[PDB]
Design a protein around this nucleic acid. Structure first.
Ligand SMILES: [Ca+2]
Ligand SMILES: [Ca+2]
Length: 887
DNA sequence: TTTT
DNA sequence: TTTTTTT
């Protein structure tokens, strides 16, 4: 047969309604033998009003169209070009249907022989990609998009990206044969005949790169590390000097001093705390301090970071830089927890043919291909979202490992005699021994940005009951004889009555009813929970808010748990002679559900500090009930302090009232803790406006008005970039709209706080030299800032946490004076992290909150300004000063 | 999510 | 013995 031809089709349209919209541009790229042979592109004219939204999107305007044909002209042309091809397009559903109707209105019956959806092929072939949006996908794969949203290019990109995947689908038939039989259950589009054609026209050859077929799974043999080559007999200084010289960096005394500090504390197995608040130097500091510790003693150093950008700059920027200083080739490994690695027990998921969620079938195909690639086996690097992550998190939670399972976690175990630098995240470090065993693998660790460590303790200390999780679990049992487990039990009982299996009698009808009675006892619970949620503080905010409610009795909820737990055990007792796999897995499922409820009931029967949560007031389908099963002070000490010989704490903000006591208090027994600490100060200037009235939310409008007035004053005196740290949503949007209205900020682009691609806002902010400013919320720490000229930071108010903050809710039981011991030291450290970032060039700071001057605790706040120059007065003294700095 |  | 909504 003539090799099939592929029509990769793209349509720009006026809308999404199949019956109410027209094609306004069709681009086609044709493909055969993994190669482009022809392309088709013709703007299509529509007598409809193209709404402005499609114009900013498609770059297409109405005046362009009046010279393009209507669709019925080219209609016979297009059909005659695509009639005998295979139809291909991203979200083919949307594409094919539109061109199917447009052909119908020209008396043309398009019934294509074979349909292909690249969204499926891309999900399988590129399973580690963060998004499958055709634009960003093309960017992650060295594909140049000359222009975005054009169909003649969206059709080429979608065709090129196809040709990669088709060439990537060229490995081993034992694996390709897996995907043929898995492709069938795709139950979406005709793709099997593609693999069926690569099986026929296949060329057999072994490959040693990929390892043996563990069971049936084929994978890539992780490559271990070897003995490190570190020949250096100098001192830490001579290394530093050479290093700073070789990299073309500037010598810094305190940095290298810091470096000698860290080595000294390790060699002696000590426990320091180092508030540095330095610049980029800290990154190289650790590296050389840890690199030295190994050359001298041969021990290993874990580096637990807070974020990824910190972990990366030191992993892939400052490591190949350091490895030019010599033939160093040091070893750094991103050591995560044990659960976050693959056990190659996915053969069990593979054996789960009953899986019909489709999304999982893709995961089955994703895992099969990801596993011949990943050098680490880190699950998260396979970005997992929605249902997929929920099933895979569910299977991994109850996985009963086998005697000889090839687990990717054990690569860390058998190879940390050779990683001089191991790097982690604080959230992994504090997991339980069974969850995370790094204390048994690394004896020496340096926690970075350690003031956020108790905040990470707060999420590993609470357990949760999720309406969503319970709903999914019930879903995996079924409520009728046509649903997963219940459907299988049917075949079992059927096979007792028909195939005569040695199974005992099973009341499938009773179980089905029994299972429906469970479904109602659950809803009944989330109603008693829900109504006291609807009967509480209602916050009306465009951003969906987490209305965490804290006041409630726990008797009626405890009576609905005792009801639902007792019936689960009764449904289990129908099955005691459980020798069959299906009825075994069914019991394991029903049993795990019983433990989720039993654990919360066991936490609420006792009286553990407990609270409810919800995500939407209208959607009762997102209720979550939380309980405090452990104590943070306990979690920190045992999982970290007690289980580490040399533990060096270092952060930009670790000192309160000049006393680390406000940090060591959580470490009970307060075992001896060595203390430590280490131009910009005077290059900076603070201004406390006096005209500003006090913070009164009752009347938040004249406060934001005084803020825009200063933003007005600054922006007109000197157009350097600005930064207004905000702690409130209402207030941040109030000034962001008040900025966009006044014409003084014409030629000025304001940026709000958006979680999606938040980093992008920073990119655009630097993209301009003097036309940018931005309000934000609790984002002080991460941000760095650079420009030409003056530098301003405006803090709206002292960053206190309300008594309605769950962080406070979970911590109140754990402190005597929850204000003096916790929320005040947190407010200060957060406050002094906006400041720390500003100082660098010269700059100023503006603190609008007058609590800093006329409050009893003002002392602790003005302590963070001892090295600056404070001043107070009108917006007039602010103007003169703003001119004074330029002088 | 992922296509206008 | 002092305080208001993100990450
Ligand atoms: Ca399309
Ligand atoms: Ca397009």
């Amino acid at each position: 047969m003539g090799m099939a031809t592929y029509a990769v089709v793209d349509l720009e349209t006026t809308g999404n309604q199949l019956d109410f919209d027209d094609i306004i541009q069709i681009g086609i790229t044709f493909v055969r033998n993994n190669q482009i042979i022809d392309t088709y592109h013709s703007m299509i004219r529509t007598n409809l009003e193209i709404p402005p939204f499609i114009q900013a999107l498609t770059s297409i305007e109405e005046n362009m169209l009046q010279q393009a044909p209507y669709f019925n002209q080219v209609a016979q042309e297009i059909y005659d070009k695509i009639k005998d091809c295979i139809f291909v397009a991203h979200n083919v559903d949307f594409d094919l249907n539109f061109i199917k109707k447009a052909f119908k209105d020209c008396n043309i019956q398009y019934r294509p022989k074979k349909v292909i959806d690249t969204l499926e092929i891309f999900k399988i072939a590129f399973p580690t990609d963060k998004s499958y949006q055709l634009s960003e996908l093309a960017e992650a794969h060295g594909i140049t998009l000359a222009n975005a949203h054009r169909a003649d290019e969206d059709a080429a990109t979608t065709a090129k990206l196809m040709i990669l995947a088709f060439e990537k689908f060229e490995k081993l038939p034992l694996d390709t044969l897996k995907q043929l039989y898995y492709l069938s259950k795709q139950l979406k589009y005709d793709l099997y005949d593609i693999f069926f054609e690569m099986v026929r026209q296949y060329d057999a050859k072994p490959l040693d790169k990929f390892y043996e077929k563990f069971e049936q799974i084929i994978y890539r043999k992780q490559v271990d590390f070897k003995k490190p080559t570190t020949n250096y007999n100098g001192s830490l200084k001579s290394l530093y000097r050479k290093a700073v010289d070789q990299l073309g960096l500037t010598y810094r005394p305190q940095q290298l001093y810091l470096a000698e500090t860290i080595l000294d504390q390790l060699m002696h197995s000590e426990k320091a705390m180092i508030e540095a608040s330095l610049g980029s130097g800290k990154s190289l500091a650790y590296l050389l301090a840890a690199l030295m510790y190994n050359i001298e003693t041969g021990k290993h150093v874990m580096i637990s970071t807070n974020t990824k950008l910190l972990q990366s700059q030191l992993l892939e920027k400052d490591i190949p830089a350091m490895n030019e200083a010599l033939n160093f080739k040091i070893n750094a490994l991103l050591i995560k927890s044990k659960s976050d690695y693959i056990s190659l027990g996915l053969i069990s998921q593979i054996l789960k043919d009953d899986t019909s969620n489709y999304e999982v079938n893709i995961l089955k195909m994703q895992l099969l291909i990801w596993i011949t690639e990943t050098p680490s086996g880190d699950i998260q690097e396979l970005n997992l979202k929605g249902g997929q992550k929920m099933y895979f998190d569910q299977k991994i939670e109850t996985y009963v490992p086998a005697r000889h399972d090839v687990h990717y976690y054990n690569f860390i175990k058998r190879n940390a005699q050779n990683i001089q630098i191991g790097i982690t995240n604080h959230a992994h470090l504090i997991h339980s021994d069974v969850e995370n065993s790094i204390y048994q693998l690394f004896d020496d660790c340096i926690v970075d940005e350690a003031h956020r460590l108790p905040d990470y303790a707060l999420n590993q200390v609470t357990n949760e009951l999720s309406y969503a999780d319970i709903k999914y679990q019930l879903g995996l049992i079924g409520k009728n004889e046509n649903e997963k487990l219940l459907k299988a039990i049917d075949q079992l009982e059927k096979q007792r009555i028909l195939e005569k299996l040695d199974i005992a009698p099973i009341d499938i009808f009773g179980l089905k009813a029994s299972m429906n009675e469970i479904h109602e006892l659950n809803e009944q619970l989330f109603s008693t929970i829900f109504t006291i949620i609807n009967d509480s503080d209602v916050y009306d905010d465009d951003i969906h808010r987490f209305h965490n409610v804290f006041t409630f009795e726990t008797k009626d909820i405890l009576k609905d748990l005792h009801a639902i737990i007792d019936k689960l055990n009764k449904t289990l007792e129908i099955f005691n002679g459980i020798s069959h796999k299906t009825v075994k897995s069914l019991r394991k499922q029903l049993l795990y559900l019983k433990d989720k409820f039993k654990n919360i009931e066991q936490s609420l029967k006792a009286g553990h500090t407990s609270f409810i949560s919800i995500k939407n007031l209208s959607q009762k389908s997102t209720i979550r009930l939380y309980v405090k099963d452990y104590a943070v002070k306990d979690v920190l000490t045992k999982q970290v302090l007690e289980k580490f010989k040399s533990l060096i704490f270092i952060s930009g903000t670790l000192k309160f009232n000049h006393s680390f006591e406000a940090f060591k208090q959580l470490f009970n027994k307060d075992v001896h803790f060595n203390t430590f600490e280490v131009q910009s100060a005077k290059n900076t200037s603070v201004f406390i406006p006096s005209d500003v009235a006090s913070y009164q939310y009752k009347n938040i409008d004249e406060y934001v008005a005084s803020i825009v007035s200063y933003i007005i004053e600054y922006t007109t005196i000197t157009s350097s970039k600005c930064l207004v740290l905000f702690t409130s949503y209402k207030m941040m949007h109030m000034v962001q709209d008040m900025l966009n209205e006044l014409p003084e900020f014409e030629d000025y682009v304001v940026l709000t706080q958006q979680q999606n691609q938040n980093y992008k806002i920073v990119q655009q902010f630097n993209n301009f030299d003097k036309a940018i400013l931005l309000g934000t919320s609790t984002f002080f720490e991460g941000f760095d800032f650079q420009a030409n000229g003056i530098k301003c930071v405006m803090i709206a108010k002292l960053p206190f946490m309300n008594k309605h903050n769950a962080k406070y809710w979970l911590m109140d039981s754990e402190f005597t004076s929850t204000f003096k011991e916790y929320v005040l030291p947190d407010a200060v450290t957060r406050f002094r992290q906006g400041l720390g970032r500003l100082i660098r060039d010269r700059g100023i700071i503006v603190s609008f909150d007058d609590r800093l001057i006329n409050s009893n605790y003002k002392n602790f706040f003005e302590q963070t300004l001892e090295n600056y120059r404070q001043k107070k007065g009108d917006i007039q003294q602010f103007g003169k000063l703003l001119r004074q700095i330029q002088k």
